[model samples]
Target chain A: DIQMTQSPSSLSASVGDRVTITCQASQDINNFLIWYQQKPGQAPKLLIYDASTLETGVPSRFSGSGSGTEFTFTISSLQPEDLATYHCQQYDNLPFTFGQGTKLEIK
Target chain B: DIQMTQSPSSLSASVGDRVTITCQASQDINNFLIWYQQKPGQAPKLLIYDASTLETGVPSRFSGSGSGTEFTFTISSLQPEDLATYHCQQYDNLPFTFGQGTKLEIK
Candidate 1:
């Protein structure tokens, strides 16, 4: 089973600040990674998939990069609405796994 | 893009009770659907994928059925740990939309 580990479990930044979250998989997962954002009491919204392909309608400020075992999700200029939890998931194998999550808070 | 709609936004039931959640898609999505379970402060976990196939290690109590636009997720016997939000997503389309979600609580 492949595991996903995310860094900076929690982050606090001012609006317009740039933020980056990292996710490392226990093994190579090719480019089957996806990034999602979740607000309180709401379902997650897909941000990027296949590593860096931004999901339709997602803001341009949001971008993803890297492949294989290491990946990164970035918000070029954060907005208040971006104050939520971001998760990374890999679909390379059965029992797809997700990172614990990165909570983005407004400073 | 296919939209997924889930019913009974929230449910309350006693332990050992059987529970069911429904998901309807705006258009046909074949069997490219997945169900997820998410607990508070945690990333969503894959429960069933490919519509009715259980992910590895997912308990037998959890099952899914239906294809195309209508689907049902069932829990044969609920447990205390079953409290969480359940979401259904359709991967047959590009956007890969998810249901609003159904919250389950133990009464």
Candidate 2:
């Protein structure tokens, strides 16, 4: 099983701030990384997949970039609605793993 | 992108009770459905993949079935640890979509 280690378990940022979260895989996952956002009491919503492709209907402010074992999720010009927890996942192999998660709060 | 609609938004059950959740996709997904469990303050855990293939380490009580546009996840015997939100996801196409989610509560 590949292990995904995410940094900054939690963070606080003001609206319009650029917030970034990082994820590292135990082994190279190439560009199979994906990112998601989950607000309290709601299901997680896919933001980016295949490392850097933004999902349809997702805001342009949300972007992902990286390859191999390291990846990053960035929210440029964060909005009030962006305040939530973000997680990274790898679908390269079985026992698919997820990052610990980064909770984004309003500052 | 395929849209996944999950039913019953929420359910309450007792230990040993059989609990099931359903998810419907807007278009045929060819058995690419997956199920996940998300406990409070934790990242979602993959339970079943390819409609019915149980992920490694997942208990037998948790089973999945269905193909095309509809799918079901059944817990033969619910446990306290099963009290959490369940989500269905599809990777059959681009912009993989997820269901609204079903909150399972212990009664």
Candidate 3:
């Protein structure tokens, strides 16, 4: 299982502020990473995949970058509706793992 | 981008009862489907992948079936630890969409 460690389990930000979250893999996963956002009582929605490609319907403010064992998901301009938990997933191997998650709270 | 629709948004069952959840994709996605279980305040854990292949260390009670546009995830005998939300995802396309999710509760 590839372990994913995420930093700053929680964050407080206002609408229009930039928010960033990081994920480090236990080992190099190349660039096979994906980012997701989950709101309370809802399933996760894909935001970015394959490192930097935005998923369809995802806001333009959301972007992903990084390579090897480290990756980051950033919300260039956060919106009130963007207050949710964000997670990173690596699908490069079996027993794919996810980051603990970063909860974004409205300020 | 593929759209995944999961049925029975929520369900309740006994500890030893059989529990099943279904996911339907908007288009054929071959066998690139995966299943995950998410506990409250924790990251989602991969359970099954490539349609029916179980992830390492996952219990035998959890199984997945189906291909193309339809899929099912079943727990032979539900356990206390099985109470959580289950999500089905398809990686056949670039976006890699996920189901709305099904919540399993204790009856």
Candidate 4:
């Protein structure tokens, strides 16, 4: 079983500012992680995979880092359209789990 | 790119009615499929992984079936608590994709 503990349940930021979200796992996960972005009434989109690999067609500013039990997602520069909730997921073992989610708002 | 088409973006039914949601992938996914349930303003919860394996703690009334390009999630009997959105995802390739989601309404 795996649990993802995400921090800063909510944040306020503006365009051009760097945004960061972190998630700590209950145990070692060997980088078996993924990050997703979701907006109201829309399906979630995969932003990063395997901890740091940016998914195809995703903007370059979105990046993820971490291994073992600690991981973070860094947005090089926040965009007006990037305002949405972000969630961390751990696929280390069966019964995969997701973080509670960090709702990013434009401030 | 594997496109996932989830039918009946939104549906209405009674509490005791049996409901089925289907997600059709544009291509084969090697059975690397997962299902998730999300409530408004809450984190998404994993219901089934690897196509048909139910996740721990999930209600037994929920079941997943199909393989390769067609997957279906069925609720043996709908309940008031089951009023939420259901998402089907494919993990066999990069840029993991999730269906547009099926929102359920109980009347």
Each model's TM-score? 0.88, 0.91, 0.88, 0.91
Q: In model 3, how many backbone clashes occur?
A: 0
- In the predicted model 3, the residue pairs found to clash are none
lDDT string, candidate 4, A1-107, tens digits = 88899998999998899999999999999999999998875667889999999998899999999999999999989988887899999888777788989999888
> Model 4: residues >4 Å from true position, as ranges?
none
Best by TM-score: 4
Candidate 2: regions farther than 4 A off: none
Worst 10 residues of 2 chain B by lDDT: B89-98
Worst 10 residues of 3 chain A by lDDT: A40-49
Write model 3 residue lDDT over A20-103, tens digit each, in one string: 889999999999999989887667787888989997778899999999999999889989898789989898886567898999
Clashing residue pair totals per candidate (backbone < 3 A): 0, 0, 0, 0
Compose the digit string of candidate 1's lDDT tens values, residues B1-106.
Answer: 6778999999999999999999999988888889999897666889999899998788999999998889999999999999999999887765567899999999
Error of 4 at A15 (Å): 2.3
What is candidate 1's lDDT per residue for A1-107, written digit by digit as tens?
99999988999999999999999999989988989999876678999989999987889999999978999999999899998999998878756688989999988
List, in the given order, the native-contact fraction of each candidate: 0.44, 0.56, 0.67, 0.72
Off by over 4 Å in 3: none
Question: Candidate 2: fnat, from 0 to 1?
Answer: 0.56
